[PDB]
Structure formats: C-alpha cells, structure tokens
Amino acid sequence: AEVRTIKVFTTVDNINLHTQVVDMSMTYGQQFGPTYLDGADVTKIKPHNSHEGKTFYVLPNDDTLRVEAFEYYHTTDPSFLGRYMSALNHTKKWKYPQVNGLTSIKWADNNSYLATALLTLQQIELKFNPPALQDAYYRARAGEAANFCALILAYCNKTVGELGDVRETMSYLFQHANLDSCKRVLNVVCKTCGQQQTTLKGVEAVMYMGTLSYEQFKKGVQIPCTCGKQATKYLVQQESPFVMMSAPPAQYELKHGTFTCASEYTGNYQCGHYKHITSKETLYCIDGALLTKSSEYKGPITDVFYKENSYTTTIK
Ligand SMILES: Cc1ccc(N)cc1C(=O)N[C@H](C)c1cccc2ccccc12
Ligand SMILES: [Zn+2]
Ligand SMILES: [Zn+2]
Ligand SMILES: [Zn+2]
C-alpha cells in the first residue's frame, strides 16, 4: 500500500524534544512502545490528523532517553512514566481553587490528604531535588497543580483513589528533597544506662512522632531503653527551616500565632477525612474548596508544622 505520515515530537521530560514522523496506519505502541498524550494512554491508537505538531510522552527506550529521564526525575523505574501519566489523567481533571491565597484542591478521587499536603507544602521552606518536582512545585504555587499532584502520587507509589497518610506522604516527599542543612541532636537520659546523645540528619531531623507539642519535645518526652525505665528524651540542637510533629489523632487545641499549619483527621483508621488548619491573623480551616475561620481551635489534630531556623537548648 501507500504510507501516510505526520510529524510529532516525543519526549520523556518535556524539555528535550526529539522529532519523529509516524506511519498513520500503525499504532503508536508499535513505533515507540507505550506512548501518552497528556495522560491519555494512546499506545493502541493510530495517529490522527490533528495529532501532527503535538508532543507525546514515551518510555526511555534508549540510553539518551534514560539519561534525560533521570536528569529530570531522578528515577530509573521503567514504570514511573506510566504511573505518572496514569495519575496525570485524573489530576488534570481536578479543580485547584485559590483558597485563602493558597492553592487548594476541590475534592475528587479521595484527594483529601493530597490537598492538605499541597497546602502544607506551600507554607514550609523546601527544595525538591528532582527538577520535575521543583518545576511542578513552582507551577502549583501559581495555581496549576495538576502535574505536582500527579508527581506526588508517582513518587509516593500511591495511585488515584487510593487512601493515604499525610505524615507518610510528607516522609516520602522529604526523601526527594534537599534536607542536608538539617541536623537534630537528641539527648536521652536514663536512670540506669546513663546519658547518650544522637545526631539525626535528613528526614529524621525534621520529623518526630509521639507528641504534637514542639514545646513539649523541648521539655522532654518519655521513651523506654534497654531495661524498661521510661527515659527522658529532649531536643538539644535543631537547625532546619521547619519541623513536623505528629501523633495519633486526638483532641488538641491550636492558638493564634503559635504554629504554622496543622492536619485535622476525622473518622476511622484509613476511612477518615483530612482538613487543613493554617495559622494567620486568625485560624483558617481549609477543607478542599471550603473555607471557615475561627479564633480558637480544639479538635482532632494529628500533624502540626512549626517554623524553626536554629535552636539550642538552655537545659544543662
Ligand atoms: C489515611 C491512612 C492511610 C494509610 C495509613 N497507613 C494510615 C492512614 C491514617 O488514617 N492515618 C492516621 C493519620 C492515623 C495515624 C496514626 C494512628 C491512627 C490511629 C487511628 C486512626 C488514624 C491514625
Ligand atoms: Zn545508560
Ligand atoms: Zn478520577
Ligand atoms: Zn536505660
């Protein structure tokens, strides 16, 4: 027969585009392997007449594409582009209204934890290492958070509709973020074992679970040791742009100006709903696209984010 063709660009990072010309009789998958058009798995679709001139994502099918894929994503998972494109299929259809000067997400596909995670990220000082994450991190702040949410799902190994934790989401996100000007020096005192200090760097430096009160963490908290005496572990040195305090959900009161932002969890284990409290001239309860404000807050808090720059204790 006769061969018809159109001109289309393929890419893995949407920065370096490689030009291709494809037979319109054969499907995309035969010519490139799996192929996507803005999240549409067009692997089994023959090229159309309107497709000419557009840009499609392909898998890293040669080392030039593999290197470009790493330099933008810092991942070598062959599934990453497919998982990212599957997430982008749903996130591009979500709505991202500007609530209280922050880019929130209107509820859909069980994105409650992603919304309060998105709002939290807009208030803490964080540098993402993958250029895909930073670029999309940037574009979320401007109001276009479709790719950022899709990459968050991709990097956290979560899928659309699947339920997840904000505390476990931020942990994954902190792995893929530059936290090296970050150091926590814990010191533990036991009546029998004696005294020993630890130096935590990276994710463990900014995260702790057991109590929401960062002031209480400064006084000291109770932990066991090799014998069974509840020892006192207290913060000594903290150098990080922020700290995340966590604890299983319980009634907790928040005050005007004493914190940065919080995570509200209501309901059963896993089957609950997330809401975001942020500390402003007053307290704001951002629930997806919904917004209510109050001067006091006592409710089911599980994560509290505090601003820090550098801290050294006065406890001898
Ligand atoms: C939404 C979700 C998805 C996956 C996983 N693994 C957990 C959760 C989740 O609900 N976590 C919350 C915050 C939670 C944490 C710690 C103790 C809790 C006890 C009771 C109820 C909730 C508790
Ligand atoms: Zn190679
Ligand atoms: Zn959906
Ligand atoms: Zn001991």
Side-chain angles (χ1 to χ4, degrees), residues 233-275:
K233 172 214 290 171
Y234 66 102
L235 184 55
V236 167
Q237 182 70 74
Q238 179 84 77
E239 289 180 352
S240 58
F242 68 97
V243 289
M244 180 181 185
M245 299 302 290
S246 285
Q251 294 271 320
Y252 190 88
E253 202 180 284
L254 304 167
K255 292 293 295 178
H256 161 83
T258 43
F259 70 106
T260 298
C261 63
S263 292
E264 185 189 27
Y265 192 74
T266 294
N268 282 2
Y269 188 47
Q270 302 192 138
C271 133
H273 185 51
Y274 269 108
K275 291 177 179 182

Side-chain angles (χ1 to χ4, degrees), residues 24 40 55 167 250 258:
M24 287 191 54
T55 299
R167 194 202 66 85
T258 43

Side-chain angles (χ1 to χ4, degrees), residues 158-176:
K158 289 289 178 176
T159 50
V160 184
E162 183 180 353
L163 304 183
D165 213 41
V166 178
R167 194 202 66 85
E168 307 177 358
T169 299
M170 303 291 295
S171 178
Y172 264 98
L173 285 184
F174 290 165
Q175 323 284 325
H176 301 88

Side-chain angles (χ1 to χ4, degrees), residues 28-163:
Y28 276 126
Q30 291 168 315
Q31 317 193 250
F32 298 140
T35 308
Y36 310 91
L37 174 57
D38 204 48
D41 182 5
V42 295
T43 302
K44 299 180 177 175
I45 288 171
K46 306 183 184 176
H48 271 70
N49 306 261
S50 53
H51 282 180
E52 187 168 8
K54 291 177 184 178
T55 299
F56 289 59
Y57 286 10
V58 303
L59 291 179
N61 60 41
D62 61 359
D63 290 346
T64 315
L65 285 174
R66 307 178 212 282
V67 171
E68 286 173 358
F70 181 86
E71 289 182 335
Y72 197 65
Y73 300 108
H74 293 106
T75 198
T76 51
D77 285 326
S79 67
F80 185 88
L81 296 201
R83 294 195 291 103
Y84 169 38
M85 288 288 97
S86 284
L88 189 75
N89 215 23
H90 292 261
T91 60
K92 74 182 180 182
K93 305 201 68 169
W94 294 350
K95 287 295 175 291
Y96 306 86
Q98 286 272 134
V99 190
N100 207 17
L102 298 167
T103 299
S104 182
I105 314 165
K106 178 190 174 179
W107 192 92
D109 293 331
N110 288 320
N111 66 351
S112 53
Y113 80 107
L114 292 169
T116 179
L118 177 59
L119 300 160
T120 296
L121 288 166
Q122 297 176 102
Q123 303 172 77
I124 62 180
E125 184 157 307
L126 200 65
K127 183 73 178 183
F128 286 116
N129 295 328
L133 274 182
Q134 200 70 239
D135 285 348
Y137 176 57
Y138 266 170
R139 266 178 35 83
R141 306 194 57 101
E144 290 185 321
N147 290 89
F148 190 55
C149 295
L151 294 167
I152 287 177
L153 287 172
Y155 281 103
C156 301
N157 302 318
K158 289 289 178 176
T159 50
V160 184
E162 183 180 353
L163 304 183

